[PDB]
Design goal:
Order of helices and strands: EEEEHHEEHHEEEEEEEE
Largest sheet: 5 strands, mixed
Number of domains: 1
Shape: globular
CATH class: Mainly Beta
Strand order of the largest sheet: 1-3-11-8-13
Helix content: 10-25%
Structural class: alpha+beta
CATH architecture: Sandwich
Bound molecules: ligand H3X, N-oxalylglycine, fe (iii) ion
């Protein structure tokens, strides 16, 4: 069930055949009588290798994710936990942009779609830990988001290196239950990716993310006891040919934490990244 540098748990994948018949969709809030989806979630046992022994060796180009040290003020943390929208869109956005610039040397970072999450929150499934394995954007979604958020500069910006990141930070520390797991992007096969339209409304409103199916080739990681100063940067898209075109991420129930542990809290924001290495 567990060892010194790894443990076992479960995450919700999709079937390895899913999406070959027709386009997959999932309704967030189906009305009574409305079919919620044309596919089933399927849990699968996964071995989560602790990244803590090798924390600094993980790379956005090689693995598709990285862990970086970046302390922010306690006052900003409590403002974020207090659902201060101005604190998120102002100071924290600026924090995330500066961090990504530090890490990648990019010329321009655009933050969007912040999500503050709490174990068994009351803000819905997007304010709660993610239980389905996913990559936030397909190529079509990352490209669309660039036009949506950059307007006239989109074509100019897309002539250079274009990446999309999920930047994840714990709000209470250390993270024990429901940590954010990440997979080595070199161990994702093309057949593991399945676009799924997430219908927050009646009809499809954007381009879709990827959901993953399980493979034994996948090498899954987590950073045990992650602290508020340890930031996870997970690559959702990359326009350059690198060993990891993308990573994927999801949370899992840790089998060795007390039942009465306090709820996991965190904030993740997405960002478009132009330039850099
Ligand atoms: C429990 O839901 C999750 O596990 C994930 C999640 O928590 C969130 C917040 C999501 O945002 C998505 C899809 C995911 C990754 C889901 C799968 C949808 C639901 C709304 C915002 C869009 C958007 C920003 C317009 O960009 C898109 O490319 C379309 C897909 C996302 C990224
Ligand atoms: O925090 C979680 O459980 C899930 N987070 C994400 O999917 C993300 O950062 O894109
Ligand atoms: Fe995500």
């Amino acid at each position: 069930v567990g060892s010194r540098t790894w443990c076992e748990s479960e995450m919700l994948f999709v079937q390895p055949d899913a999406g070959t018949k027709e386009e997959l969709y999932y309704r967030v809030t189906p009305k009574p009588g409305q079919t919620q989806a044309n596919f089933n979630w399927t849990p699968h046992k996964v071995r989560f290798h602790d990244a803590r022994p090798q924390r600094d060796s993980f790379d956005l180009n090689t693995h598709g994710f990285t862990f970086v040290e970046d302390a922010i003020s306690p006052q900003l943390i409590e403002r974020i936990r207090a659902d201060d929208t101005a604190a998120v869109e102002g100071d924290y956005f600026a924090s995330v942009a500066a961090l990504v610039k530090r890490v990648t040397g990019a010329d321009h970072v655009v933050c969007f779609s912040p999500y503050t999450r709490k174990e068994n929150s009351e803000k819905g499934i997007f304010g709660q830990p993610a239980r389905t394995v996913h990559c936030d954007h397909t190529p079509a979604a990352a490209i669309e988001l660039t036009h949506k958020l950059c307007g006239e500069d989109a074509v100019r910006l897309l002539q250079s290196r274009f990446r999309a990141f999920s930047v994840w930070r714990p709000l209470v520390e250390p993270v024990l239950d429901w940590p954010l797991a990440v997979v080595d992007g070199r161990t994702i096969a093309p057949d593991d990716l399945h676009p799924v339209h997430w219908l927050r409304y009646e009809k499809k409103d954007t381009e879709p993310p990827f959901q993953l199916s399980f493979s034994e080739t996948q090498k899954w990681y987590y950073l045990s006891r992650q602290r508020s100063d340890e930031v996870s940067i997970v690559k959702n898209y990359d326009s350059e040919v690198v060993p990891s075109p993308r990573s994927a991420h999801c949370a899992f129930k840790h089998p060795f934490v007390p039942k009465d542990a306090p709820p996991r809290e965190s904030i993740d924001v997405r960002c478009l990244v132009f330039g850099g290495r």
